[PDB]
């Protein structure tokens, strides 16, 4: 790891400085005792968020507003790191956003197939995956038409609505699996094969869990590709997938997906000359912008029973 700090030294030093802004398990105990959104704003400014709500009023402080200012503060940091990267890392951070724009073309089709507005639907769309053709999504509702018309110029071009979603997403995750084993060096090889495999795991389990052929729409890059793909392909009931998921020692008893993700993410920061840190920060800060939102929904309406479901390993 003597060549990493050439192009990725300032990059990793600032990403490792962003994971100290991940507010810890003591930083939620004092943050779950507010009962008003103003008070939460008052003591969220002491963190490394650092008074990001200094421009909004206090009378009109919506629950969503905190969800989108904290995510805008996430996403400006992401494309702050992204436009400072070399050709082995600018691609890797683009391949992070390629799985986001699949969830954006999956939502633009299922929003434009029904009677809905472009502007209102566009607001919900995730802004890291955003190509210039994505605001259209209205030339045709046919799946075949979209590829030639609108997806031909995208970087989704080498890759019914959920059927073409998993058809894009499996070929994406296969192409993202054999990229991180080709051009990314040794301390992030074992990371971007295991962490990525986990993402293939909890998507392939959600295939059979949402289906209750299926062998072509399931990604095969993880630990369930050789053995559990055939057992999970012919599972028609919940007990068939419950018996098929017992073969893996790391997934037995789970059928708890994000808790296993965050525990697999806290070991990703244990390496310190790897580029798996920026994925661990992205999924950790995207975790703690839905932890803050889960707390602020229990504060906006008084739901004091189910607050302690936030999950922080860092």
């Amino acid at each position: 790891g003597v060549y990493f700090n050439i192009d990725n030294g300032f990059i990793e030093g600032v990403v490792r400085g962003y994971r100290n802004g991940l507010l810890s398990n003591n930083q939620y105990i004092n943050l779950t005792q507010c009962d008003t959104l103003e008070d939460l704003k008052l003591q969220l400014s002491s963190t490394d968020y650092g008074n990001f709500l200094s421009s909004v009023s206090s009378e009109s402080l919506t629950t969503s507003l905190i969800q989108e200012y904290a995510s805008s503060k996430l996403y400006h940091e992401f494309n702050y790191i992204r436009d400072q990267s070399s050709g082995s890392t600018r691609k890797f951070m683009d391949y992070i956003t390629y799985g986001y724009m699949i969830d954006n073309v999956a939502l633009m089709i299922t929003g434009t197939i029904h009677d809905r507005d472009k502007g209102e639907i566009l607001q919900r769309c995730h802004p890291l995956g955003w190509f210039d053709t994505l605001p259209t999504l209205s030339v045709a509702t046919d799946l075949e038409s979209l590829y030639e018309t609108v997806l031909v110029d995208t970087p989704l071009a080498p890759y019914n609505i959920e059927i073409i979603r998993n058809k894009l997403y499996k070929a994406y995750l296969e192409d993202f699996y054999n990229f991180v084993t080709e051009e990314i060096p040794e301390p992030a090889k074992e990371c971007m094969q295991t962490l990525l495999g986990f993402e293939a795991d909890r998507r392939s389990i959600n295939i059979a869990l949402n289906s209750l052929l299926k062998s072509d729409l399931l990604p095969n890059i993880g630990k369930l590709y050789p053995l559990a793909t055939f057992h999970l392909a012919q599972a028609q009931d919940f007990e068939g997938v419950r018996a098929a998921l017992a073969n893996v020692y790391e997934y037995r008893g789970f059928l708890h997906f994000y808790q296993l993700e965050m525990e697999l993410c806290r070991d990703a920061f244990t390496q310190q000359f790897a580029i798996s840190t920026v994925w661990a920060w992205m999924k950790s800060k995207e975790q703690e912008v839905r932890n803050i939102t889960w707390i602020a929904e229990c504060i906006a309406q008084n739901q004091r029973e189910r607050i302690n479901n936030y999950i922080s390993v860092y």
Partner: protein, 38 residues
């Protein structure tokens, strides 16, 4: 006499011009990295 074509002066001029070509080619590789990755 070492030899008549590969004399010791040609060799010591060709080693200090192969070492300087080695630390030229690796330095051009480093500069080339900017072009390849930006």
């Amino acid at each position: 006499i070492l030899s008549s074509i590969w004399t010791e002066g040609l060799l010591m001029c060709l080693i200090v011009s192969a070492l300087l070509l080695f630390i030229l080619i690796v330095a051009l590789s480093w500069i080339s990295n900017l072009d390849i990755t930006y």
